[PDB]
């Protein structure tokens, strides 16, 4: 979930930016090339709240680049498996549901959603529904679900969810 952690990155700064605004260039490159990157060990990173300190910048021998070690406090979203989260379902299919917990794409199987729910195609928000239409899960419904499987693909994280419990329905 939405943590405020401290983690570290290394900036390979090119000698063009060796002027008065060197440190500003270090900050700007941190904000640029870490924000939005999905490190599967640390989940998605949303925005770098602050930087603690910019380390001593070693000149790489023979390469000219200066490798500044920067440590920064940033917002992080992490999907611990077995968690109830506030999804927003976006695409419905025979296999199940494809939803968006924020930055994250999540999938719910047809046998991880209750048996009284069945696929109703051809409704213009094609949705899973009960037999007598008790509650319908169409596009853009704030379903809560238990993420139970989490897969890291080094680009994003795809979580696998379920609705086999109490209190896992539309809100």
């Amino acid at each position: 979930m939405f943590y405020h952690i401290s983690l570290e990155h290394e900036i390979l700064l090119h000698p063009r930016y060796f002027g008065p605004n060197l440190l500003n260039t270090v900050k700007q490159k941190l904000f640029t090339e870490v924000e939005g990157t999905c490190t599967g060990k640390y989940g998605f990173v949303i925005a770098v709240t602050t930087i603690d300190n910019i380390g001593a910048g070693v000149i790489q021998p023979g390469r000219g680049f200066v490798l500044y070690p920067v440590k920064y406090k940033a917002i992080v979203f992490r999907p611990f498996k077995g968690e109830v989260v506030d999804a927003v379902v976006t695409q419905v299919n025979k296999v199940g549901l494809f939803t968006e917990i924020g930055p994250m794409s999540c999938f719910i199987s047809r046998h991880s959603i209750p048996s009284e729910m069945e696929f109703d195609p051809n409704s213009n928000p094609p949705c899973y529904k009960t037999m007598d239409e008790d509650i319908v899960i169409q596009q853009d419904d704030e379903i809560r679900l238990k993420i139970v499987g989490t897969r890291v693909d080094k680009n994003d994280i795809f979580a696998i969810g379920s609705l086999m419990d109490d209190y896992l329905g539309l809100v």
């Binding site: 209750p114 704030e142 809560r144 419990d165 109490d166 209190y167 896992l168 329905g169 539309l170 809100v171």
Partner: peptide
């Protein structure tokens, strides 16, 4: 399999 109460 209860209701998952509202948010309003």
């Amino acid at each position: 399999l209860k209701q998952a109460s509202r948010r309003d």
